[PDB]
Write an enzyme that holds these catalytic residues in place. Structure first.
Site, PDB file in Angstrom:
ATOM      1  N   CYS A   1       2.388   4.743   2.709  1.00 23.43           N
ATOM      2  CA  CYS A   1       3.031   3.795   1.798  1.00 23.43           C
ATOM      3  C   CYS A   1       3.212   4.344   0.355  1.00 23.43           C
ATOM      4  O   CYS A   1       4.219   4.065  -0.301  1.00 23.43           O
ATOM      5  CB  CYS A   1       2.215   2.510   1.680  1.00 23.43           C
ATOM      6  SG  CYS A   1       1.872   1.625   3.250  1.00 23.43           S
TER       7      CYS A   1
ATOM      8  N   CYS B   1      -2.801   2.828   1.104  1.00 22.89           N
ATOM      9  CA  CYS B   1      -2.130   3.283   2.279  1.00 22.89           C
ATOM     10  C   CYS B   1      -1.370   4.526   1.954  1.00 22.89           C
ATOM     11  O   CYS B   1      -0.464   4.553   1.109  1.00 22.89           O
ATOM     12  CB  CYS B   1      -1.224   2.144   2.790  1.00 22.89           C
ATOM     13  SG  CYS B   1       0.079   2.569   4.000  1.00 22.89           S
TER      14      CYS B   1
END
Length: 111
Positions: free
Chosen positions: A38, A35
């Site tokens: 992230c 991600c």
């Protein structure tokens, strides 16, 4: 080494008990390995964890804990909850650095 990675329902349940034990607010970062936003905030989150010992910093690996995540209705990654004794005091969807830091700041003085 103050960010704890949660992979099991038992380790979640343990860490929430410890924080309650010590009257810490849990910052839970429900996020994903592959991600992009992230990864973008992951070093910032470690740095925050070094600077704020009265918050317990968790990362919840949503790919691993997929059922536990549906249960917290995760709709996007990363999602942050501030938890006291399991009650949400606050929440931040997205890798918003300024906003996260401001929520940590606000929860810290007052609660």
């Amino acid at each position: 080494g103050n960010v704890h990675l949660i992979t099991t329902k038992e380790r979640w349940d343990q860490k929430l008990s410890e924080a309650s034990r010590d009257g810490k607010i849990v910052l839970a970062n429900f996020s994903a390995r592959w991600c992009g936003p992230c990864k973008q905030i992951a070093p910032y989150y470690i740095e925050l964890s070094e600077n704020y010992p009265s918050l317990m910093f968790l990362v919840i690996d949503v790919d691993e804990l997929s059922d536990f995540s549906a249960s917290w209705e995760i709709k996007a990654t990363p999602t942050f909850f501030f938890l006291r004794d399991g009650q949400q005091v606050d929440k931040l969807v997205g890798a918003n650095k300024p906003e996260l830091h401001k929520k940590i700041t606000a929860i810290l003085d007052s609660l």
